[PDB]
């Protein structure tokens, strides 16, 4: 199991912040959750698929999606509507990239009637793990614990955060068999 809470302050925003006061929620398929929902130890739980090895680089898939919603301001439409699927982690020695397919919508955070334009991204790097131990695919297992920073492409997706902002730390050792 690979564990990551994306960002604690983002999960607090969806459930208790300005998104949470206007219909904020999340839903998952294939992915669990453990810990405090708006807390530091809270993390989504990703189950690995069959890994793919290219030398010293493992690409580990994790099936399922995470769907965040919020900001119903009475128009019948969720103005925040953010789906994260096709989770994969590609290791690059001492770092690992977290890859997603997203569907989201842009916003100026002012218009409470009109949903902004759809944005998608396929095989987009969302974050990079500075790994505690370097990833070796020849050992049969990869420890994914480490600290994370937000990518330039996820920073377009999350809007409010800077490029290279810290995200939630990761944990868990997964096997590569399936
Ligand atoms: C009309 C719609 C929206 C309004 C009025 C709005 C307003 C706000 C407000 C008041 C905050 C401050 C909350 C806080 O700091 O605790 C906030 C933060 C934030 N908003 Fe929005 N927002 C809207 C839509 C969106 C959308 C579509 C996104 C999608 C990317 C988004 C992403 C964020 C993020 C990431 C934060 C930072 C949360 C954190 O970690 O503390 N917002 N917004």
Task: Give the experimental resolution in Å.
Answer: 1.9
The answer, yes or no, to whether any atom of ligand 1 lies below 6 A from the CB of 75, is no
Q: Please give the backbone phi and psi of residue 121, each rounded to the nearest 5 degrees, phi first.
A: -155, 130
Residue nearest (by alpha carbon) to ligand 1 atom 27: 80
- For residues 30 and 65, give the distance between their C-alpha atoms in angstroms, rounded to a whole number: 7
88 lines ligand 1 (CB under 6 A): no
Q: Is 84 in the pocket of ligand 1 (CB under 6 A)?
A: no
The number of the ligand 1 atom at minimal distance from the alpha carbon of 158 is 30
Q: What distance in Å separates the CA atoms of residue 123 and residue 171, rounded to the nearest whole number? A: 22
Structure tokens, 101: 């397919």
- CB of residue 107 inside a 6 A radius of ligand 1: yes
CB 141 within 8 A of CB 176: yes
Structural domain count, the chain: 1
| Cα distance between residue 71 and residue 21, in whole Å | 8
Closest to 91 (Cα-Cα) out of 137, 46, 48, 125: 137
8-state DSSP, 163: T
With a 6 A CB cut-off, is 53 part of the ligand 1 pocket?
no
Contact 61, 31 (CB under 8 A): no
Output 81-84 pairs: Cβ under 8 A, ≥24 positions apart. Answer: 81/105, 81/115, 82/157, 84/126
CA distances from 59 to 37, 80, 169, 178 (A): 28, 30, 20, 12
First to last CA, the chain: 12
What beta strand segments (E) does the chain contain? 2-4, 25-29, 32-34, 43-46, 52-54, 57-72, 78-91, 95-105, 118-131, 141-143, 146-150, 173-175
Which two structure tokens, joined as six digits, stand for 62?
Answer: 């994790």
Whether residue 7 contacts residue 38, with contact meaning beta carbons closer than 8 Å, is answered with no
Method: X-ray
- 11 Cβ inside 6 Å of ligand 1: no
Q: Which atom of ligand 1 is nearest to the CA of 7?
A: 40
Residue 77 Cβ contacting ligand 1 at under 6 Å: no
> At a CB cut-off of 8 Å and minimum separation 6, what does 31 contact?
44, 45, 46, 47, 62, 64, 65, 66, 87
* Helix then strand then coil, % of the chain, to nearest 5: 10, 50, 40
Judging by beta carbons within 10 Å of its beta carbon (0-12, 13-18, 19+), is residue 132 exposed, middle or buried?
A: middle
Tell me how far apart the alpha carbons of residues 37 and 34 are, in angstroms, rounded to a whole number: 8
C-alpha 18 to ligand 1 mean position (Å): 7
The residue whose two tokens read 């131990």 is 133
Distances (CA, A) of 111 to 20, 24, 72, 74: 17, 17, 12, 12
- Cα of 109 vs centre of ligand 1, distance in Å, is 7
* Domain of 38, in residue numbers: 2-175
Distance of alpha carbon 145 from alpha carbon 45, whole angstroms: 13
């Amino acid at each position: 199991s690979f564990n990551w809470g994306i960002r604690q302050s983002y999960r607090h925003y969806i459930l208790k912040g300005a998104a949470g006061k206007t219909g904020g929620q999340w839903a998952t398929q294939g992915i669990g959750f453990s810990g405090d929902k708006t807390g530091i130890d809270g993390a989504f739980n990703f189950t690995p698929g069959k890994a793919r090895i290219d030398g010293n680089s493992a690409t580990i898939p994790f099936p399922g999606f995470i769907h965040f919603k919020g900001h119903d301001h009475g128009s019948g439409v969720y103005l925040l509507d953010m789906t994260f699927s096709d989770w994969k982690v590609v290791t690059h020695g001492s770092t690992a990239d977290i890859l997603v397919d997203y569907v989201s919508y842009d916003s100026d955070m002012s218009n409470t009637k009109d949903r902004g334009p759809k944005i998608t991204g396929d095989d987009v790097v969302l974050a990079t793990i500075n790994l505690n131990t370097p990833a070796d695919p020849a050992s049969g297992s990869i420890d994914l614990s480490g600290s994370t920073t937000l990518s330039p492409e996820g920073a377009k997706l999350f809007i409010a955060y800077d490029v290279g902002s810290p995200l939630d730390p990761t944990s868990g050792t997964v096997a590569l068999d399936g």
